[PDB]
Design an enzyme around this catalytic site. Sequence first.
Site: not given
Ligand SMILES: COc1ccc(-c2ccc(S(=O)(=O)c3ccccc3[C@H](CCC(=O)O)C(=O)O)cc2)cc1
Ligand SMILES: [Zn+2]
Length: 159
Positions: A114-115, A118, A124
């Site tokens: 996911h990262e 970005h 998203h």
């Molecule tokens: C399917 O596999 C996945 C794995 C990871 C993620 C995932 C989900 C949430 C996060 S999170 O970190 O909980 C998160 C939560 C809400 C908004 C934004 C985020 C971060 C950014 C955080 C920040 O600004 O410091 C992001 O989206 O990368 C990180 C990672 C999503 C899906």
């Molecule tokens: Zn994200």
Amino acid sequence: MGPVWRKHYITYRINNYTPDMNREDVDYAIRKAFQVWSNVTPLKFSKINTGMADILVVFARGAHGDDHAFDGKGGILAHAFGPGSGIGGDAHFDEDEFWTTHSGGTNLFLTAVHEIGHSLGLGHSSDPKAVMFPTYKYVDINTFRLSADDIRGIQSLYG
Ligand SMILES: COc1ccc(-c2ccc(S(=O)(=O)c3ccccc3[C@H](CCC(=O)O)C(=O)O)cc2)cc1
Ligand SMILES: [Zn+2]
Ligand SMILES: [Ca+2]
Ligand SMILES: [Ca+2]
Ligand SMILES: [Ca+2]
Ligand SMILES: [Zn+2]
């Protein structure tokens, strides 16, 4: 369409390693996560051990030198900057999480996929099947697969 890398050969560097995992399992999880995106684009990722990489991978906690502090255990897991010079591209993982190779704690590979999305310029998705959906959930990592929405998104930027 915001920023995109304008080159096919991209470099990454692991700045520091989390104590939560074996060193080789960090390497492997990060490498695998890059391969997920190189498998659907013309991008090539190379790990470097010195010098300036495009994508710096960092494990840090709390306030760590960018304007975007982490929050301790729970909550935020990681964040990454879109393509650009300097901190652009870089991916930071909250060391207050407990990173793992499995379903316990927070899975490093899945988070990295996911990262890096970005870091490559993706935002998203509203599709809960997409790796770019804003909610972490564990899925068996050996069978993981990008959604059609993730593929369309990345190919719209690179392919
Ligand atoms: C399917 O596999 C996945 C794995 C990871 C993620 C995932 C989900 C949430 C996060 S999170 O970190 O909980 C998160 C939560 C809400 C908004 C934004 C985020 C971060 C950014 C955080 C920040 O600004 O410091 C992001 O989206 O990368 C990180 C990672 C999503 C899906
Ligand atoms: Zn994200
Ligand atoms: Ca960078
Ligand atoms: Ca956190
Ligand atoms: Ca930790
Ligand atoms: Zn950061």
